[PDB]
Design a protein around this ligand. Sequence first.
Ligand SMILES: Cc1cc2nc3c(=O)[nH]c(=O)nc-3n(C[C@H](O)[C@H](O)[C@H](O)COP(=O)(O)O)c2cc1C
Length: 147
Amino acid sequence: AKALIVYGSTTGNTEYTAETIARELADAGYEVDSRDAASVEAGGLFEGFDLVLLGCSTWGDDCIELQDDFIPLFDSLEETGAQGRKVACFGCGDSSYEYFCGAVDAIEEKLKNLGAEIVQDGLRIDGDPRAARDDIVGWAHDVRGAI
Ligand SMILES: Cc1cc2nc3c(=O)[nH]c(=O)nc-3n(C[C@H](O)[C@H](O)[C@H](O)COP(=O)(O)O)c2cc1C
Protein backbone atom coordinates (compact mmCIF):
# COMPACT_ATOMS: atom_id res chain seq x y z
CA ALA A 1 0.00 0.00 0.00
CA LYS A 2 1.24 3.48 -0.91
CA ALA A 3 0.56 6.56 1.21
CA LEU A 4 1.32 10.21 0.40
CA ILE A 5 1.83 12.83 3.11
CA VAL A 6 1.92 16.49 2.09
CA TYR A 7 2.51 19.12 4.73
CA GLY A 8 2.69 22.90 4.97
CA SER A 9 4.89 23.91 7.89
CA THR A 10 6.60 27.19 8.74
CA THR A 11 8.09 26.68 12.20
CA GLY A 12 8.31 22.91 11.80
CA ASN A 13 5.51 21.68 14.04
CA THR A 14 3.28 20.28 11.31
CA GLU A 15 6.44 18.89 9.68
CA TYR A 16 7.38 17.08 12.89
CA THR A 17 3.81 15.78 13.04
CA ALA A 18 4.09 14.53 9.46
CA GLU A 19 7.33 12.63 10.14
CA THR A 20 5.79 11.05 13.22
CA ILE A 21 2.86 9.95 11.06
CA ALA A 22 5.19 8.63 8.34
CA ARG A 23 7.06 6.46 10.83
CA GLU A 24 3.87 4.87 12.18
CA LEU A 25 2.64 4.09 8.66
CA ALA A 26 6.07 2.93 7.53
CA ASP A 27 6.38 0.56 10.49
CA ALA A 28 2.90 -0.79 9.78
CA GLY A 29 4.12 -1.79 6.33
CA TYR A 30 3.14 1.23 4.25
CA GLU A 31 5.45 2.67 1.65
CA VAL A 32 5.27 6.32 2.66
CA ASP A 33 6.04 9.28 0.44
CA SER A 34 6.36 12.39 2.61
CA ARG A 35 6.69 15.70 0.77
CA ASP A 36 6.79 19.38 1.76
CA ALA A 37 3.92 21.29 0.15
CA ALA A 38 6.47 23.79 -1.16
CA SER A 39 8.03 21.14 -3.39
CA VAL A 40 4.90 19.65 -5.01
CA GLU A 41 2.71 20.33 -8.04
CA ALA A 42 -1.07 19.94 -7.75
CA GLY A 43 -1.63 18.28 -11.13
CA GLY A 44 -2.34 14.58 -10.60
CA LEU A 45 -0.44 14.72 -7.32
CA PHE A 46 -2.43 11.89 -5.73
CA GLU A 47 -2.21 9.58 -8.76
CA GLY A 48 -1.15 6.10 -7.72
CA PHE A 49 -1.59 6.55 -3.97
CA ASP A 50 -3.85 4.40 -1.82
CA LEU A 51 -3.92 6.92 1.02
CA VAL A 52 -3.32 10.67 1.10
CA LEU A 53 -2.67 12.62 4.29
CA LEU A 54 -2.63 16.40 4.16
CA GLY A 55 -1.16 18.49 6.97
CA CYS A 56 -1.20 22.25 7.32
CA SER A 57 -0.85 24.86 10.05
CA THR A 58 -3.24 27.79 10.48
CA TRP A 59 -2.47 31.53 10.27
CA GLY A 60 -3.97 34.98 9.77
CA ASP A 61 -5.26 35.26 13.35
CA ASP A 62 -7.93 37.92 12.67
CA CYS A 63 -9.01 35.60 9.85
CA ILE A 64 -8.40 32.00 8.77
CA GLU A 65 -5.48 31.48 6.43
CA LEU A 66 -3.51 28.40 5.38
CA GLN A 67 0.26 28.04 5.66
CA ASP A 68 1.73 29.80 2.60
CA ASP A 69 3.44 26.75 1.12
CA PHE A 70 0.18 24.82 1.16
CA ILE A 71 -2.04 27.50 -0.41
CA PRO A 72 -1.07 26.73 -4.03
CA LEU A 73 -1.94 23.07 -3.51
CA PHE A 74 -5.19 23.98 -1.81
CA ASP A 75 -6.26 26.40 -4.53
CA SER A 76 -5.70 23.62 -7.06
CA LEU A 77 -7.08 20.70 -5.05
CA GLU A 78 -9.55 19.94 -7.84
CA GLU A 79 -6.63 18.76 -9.97
CA THR A 80 -5.04 16.40 -7.45
CA GLY A 81 -7.22 13.38 -8.14
CA ALA A 82 -9.12 13.43 -4.85
CA GLN A 83 -12.22 11.83 -6.40
CA GLY A 84 -12.80 8.62 -4.45
CA ARG A 85 -9.43 9.08 -2.76
CA LYS A 86 -9.06 7.87 0.82
CA VAL A 87 -7.74 10.86 2.75
CA ALA A 88 -7.30 12.29 6.24
CA CYS A 89 -6.02 15.65 7.49
CA PHE A 90 -3.95 17.05 10.34
CA GLY A 91 -2.30 20.28 11.39
CA CYS A 92 -0.86 22.24 14.28
CA GLY A 93 -2.46 25.30 15.77
CA ASP A 94 -2.74 27.33 18.95
CA SER A 95 -5.97 27.53 20.97
CA SER A 96 -4.88 31.02 22.04
CA TYR A 97 -6.14 32.19 18.65
CA GLU A 98 -9.80 32.41 17.70
CA TYR A 99 -9.97 29.68 15.03
CA PHE A 100 -8.16 26.61 16.35
CA CYS A 101 -6.58 24.68 13.45
CA GLY A 102 -9.05 26.17 11.01
CA ALA A 103 -6.75 25.13 8.19
CA VAL A 104 -7.76 21.53 8.88
CA ASP A 105 -11.50 22.21 8.44
CA ALA A 106 -10.91 24.15 5.23
CA ILE A 107 -8.92 21.31 3.66
CA GLU A 108 -11.36 18.66 4.89
CA GLU A 109 -14.34 20.59 3.54
CA LYS A 110 -12.81 21.13 0.12
CA LEU A 111 -11.64 17.51 -0.09
CA LYS A 112 -15.20 16.45 0.74
CA ASN A 113 -16.69 18.67 -1.96
CA LEU A 114 -14.23 17.15 -4.44
CA GLY A 115 -15.42 13.62 -3.71
CA ALA A 116 -12.74 12.36 -1.35
CA GLU A 117 -13.44 9.81 1.38
CA ILE A 118 -12.34 11.25 4.73
CA VAL A 119 -11.47 8.04 6.61
CA GLN A 120 -10.92 9.76 9.97
CA ASP A 121 -11.57 13.07 11.69
CA GLY A 122 -8.67 15.48 11.34
CA LEU A 123 -5.84 15.53 13.87
CA ARG A 124 -5.79 18.93 15.57
CA ILE A 125 -2.66 19.56 17.63
CA ASP A 126 -2.49 22.40 20.15
CA GLY A 127 0.98 23.76 20.87
CA ASP A 128 4.18 21.71 20.71
CA PRO A 129 3.44 18.46 18.79
CA ARG A 130 6.23 16.62 20.60
CA ALA A 131 4.14 16.92 23.76
CA ALA A 132 1.43 15.08 21.84
CA ARG A 133 3.49 12.37 20.14
CA ASP A 134 1.13 9.79 21.66
CA ASP A 135 -2.03 11.28 20.16
CA ILE A 136 -0.30 11.53 16.78
CA VAL A 137 0.86 7.90 16.69
CA GLY A 138 -2.61 6.78 17.74
CA TRP A 139 -4.33 8.92 15.13
CA ALA A 140 -2.03 7.45 12.50
CA HIS A 141 -2.89 3.99 13.80
CA ASP A 142 -6.60 4.85 13.73
CA VAL A 143 -6.67 6.16 10.15
CA ARG A 144 -4.56 3.20 9.08
CA GLY A 145 -7.06 0.73 10.50
CA ALA A 146 -10.04 2.41 8.88
CA ILE A 147 -9.27 2.52 5.16
C1 LIG B 1 0.30 35.60 13.23
C2 LIG B 1 -0.15 34.21 13.70
C3 LIG B 1 -1.42 33.75 13.53
C4 LIG B 1 -1.87 32.44 13.97
N1 LIG B 1 -3.18 32.07 13.77
C5 LIG B 1 -3.59 30.89 14.20
C6 LIG B 1 -4.98 30.49 14.02
O1 LIG B 1 -5.83 31.21 13.46
N2 LIG B 1 -5.32 29.27 14.50
C7 LIG B 1 -4.42 28.37 15.15
O2 LIG B 1 -4.87 27.32 15.53
N3 LIG B 1 -3.12 28.74 15.32
C8 LIG B 1 -2.69 29.93 14.88
N4 LIG B 1 -1.37 30.32 15.05
C9 LIG B 1 -0.46 29.38 15.73
C10 LIG B 1 0.30 28.49 14.75
O3 LIG B 1 -0.57 27.71 13.91
C11 LIG B 1 1.23 27.54 15.53
O4 LIG B 1 2.41 28.31 15.92
C12 LIG B 1 1.66 26.30 14.76
O5 LIG B 1 2.49 25.49 15.63
C13 LIG B 1 2.48 26.61 13.53
O6 LIG B 1 2.83 25.40 12.82
P1 LIG B 1 4.02 25.44 11.79
O7 LIG B 1 5.34 24.94 12.33
O8 LIG B 1 3.59 23.93 11.61
O9 LIG B 1 3.76 25.50 10.33
C14 LIG B 1 -0.89 31.59 14.63
C15 LIG B 1 0.43 32.08 14.80
C16 LIG B 1 0.85 33.34 14.37
C17 LIG B 1 2.27 33.80 14.60
